[PDB]
């Protein structure tokens, strides 16, 4: 049923209450204003438990801090230091994401496939 509904490409706000634990996702990018993308969400982590982030999401800001143009290290810092309640604005950018992962491409619903 769900898998040929388009994934929304509009910006979303996501609030994650993780205390003084990890957010539970990894990021890639951040060279030359390339952008910061979620690459891996850990099963069972706070980011997974939210239900509102996926691989291919761009992190557009964290607690009001704009990361579209962040470096990789400074995004990671922002993320780790964001505090207990972390307000992300994300936007799913599957074509952009797919250029980081090998053999991966974007289907008609906008889902990222890896062959």
């Amino acid at each position: 049923f769900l898998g040929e509904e388009d994934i929304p490409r509009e910006p979303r706000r996501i609030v994650i209450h993780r205390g003084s634990t990890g957010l539970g996702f990894n990021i890639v990018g951040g060279e030359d204003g390339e952008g910061i993308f979620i690459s891996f969400i850990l099963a069972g982590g706070p980011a997974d438990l939210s239900g509102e982030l996926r691989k291919g999401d761009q992190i557009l800001s964290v607690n009001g801090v704009d990361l579209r143009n962040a470096s990789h290290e400074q995004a990671a810092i922002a993320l780790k230091n964001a505090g207990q309640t972390v307000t992300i604005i994300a936007q799913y950018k599957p074509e952009e994401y797919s250029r980081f992962e090998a053999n991966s491409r974007v289907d008609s619903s906008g889902r990222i496939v890896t062959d």
């Binding site: 957010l23 996702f25 990894n26 990021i27 891996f40 850990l42 990671a76 993320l79």
Partner: peptide, 6 residues
């Protein structure tokens, strides 16, 4: 390179 877990 690079991917960082947060």
């Amino acid at each position: 390179k690079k991917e960082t877990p947060v």
